[PDB]
Amino acid sequence: KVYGRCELAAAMKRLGLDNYRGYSLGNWVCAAKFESNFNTHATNRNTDGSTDYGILQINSRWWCNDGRTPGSKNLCNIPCSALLSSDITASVNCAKKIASGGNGMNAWVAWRNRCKGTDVHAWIRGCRL
Numbered sequence: 013k014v015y016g017r018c019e020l021a022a023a024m025k026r027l028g029l030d031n032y033r034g035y036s037l038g039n040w041v042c043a044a045k046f047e048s049n050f051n052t053h054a055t056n057r058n059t060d061g062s063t064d065y066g067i068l069q070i071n072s073r074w075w076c077n078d079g080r081t082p083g084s085k086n087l088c089n090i091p092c093s094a095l096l097s098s099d100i101t102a103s104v105n106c107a108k109k110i111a112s113g114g115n116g117m118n119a120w121v122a123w124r125n126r127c128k129g130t131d132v133h134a135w136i137r138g139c140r141l
């Protein structure tokens with residue numbers, strides 16, 4: 013599924029991401045835009061053998077288990093295929109766990125390069141939440 017911006021913001025809001033660990037909602041909408049262009053099916057394979065899965069590009073070396081990544085820690089205790097669902101619940105619950113690390117949202121490279129530091133509140137304006 014490819015989510016609309018406001019559609020995704022609302023889905024994320026109802027799952028507890030607004031101001032999760034300080035981070036306002038537009039941070040997560042901006043992270044999903046530059047990570048996958050709001051597409052739940054996005055996958056990117058990395059040269060170390062891990063793959064990034066779903067709308068928030070969660071990595072299989074640390075967070076989910078896909079069967080093919082040497083040394084997967086599977087810290088979110090999920091199959092990576094669960095992250096390719098049109099339902100984002102599994103992705104958001106894992107993302108909360110990722111964001112709880114010392115690095116916070118810097119675990120998302122696209123958010124640190126294209127979102128961090130800007131007025132990310134723009135990503136939810138016009139959405140009547």
Ligand SMILES: CC(=O)N[C@@H]1[C@@H](O)[C@H](O[C@@H]2O[C@H](CO)[C@@H](O[C@@H]3O[C@H](CO)[C@@H](O)[C@H](O)[C@H]3NC(C)=O)[C@H](O)[C@H]2NC(C)=O)[C@@H](CO)O[C@H]1O
Binds near residue numbers: 064069070071120
């Ligand atoms: C969205 C996504 O999947 N992003 C992936 C990143 O999460 C991943 O970054 C690595 O994440 C781990 C776990 O949060 C980092 O480990 C922490 O590192 C510090 C020192 O930097 C250490 O003291 C902590 O104890 C340790 N935390 C845990 C829970 O073990 C690790 O440093 C991150 N590494 C880098 C280079 O950022 C990266 C790379 O595997 O992939 C993203 O796709």
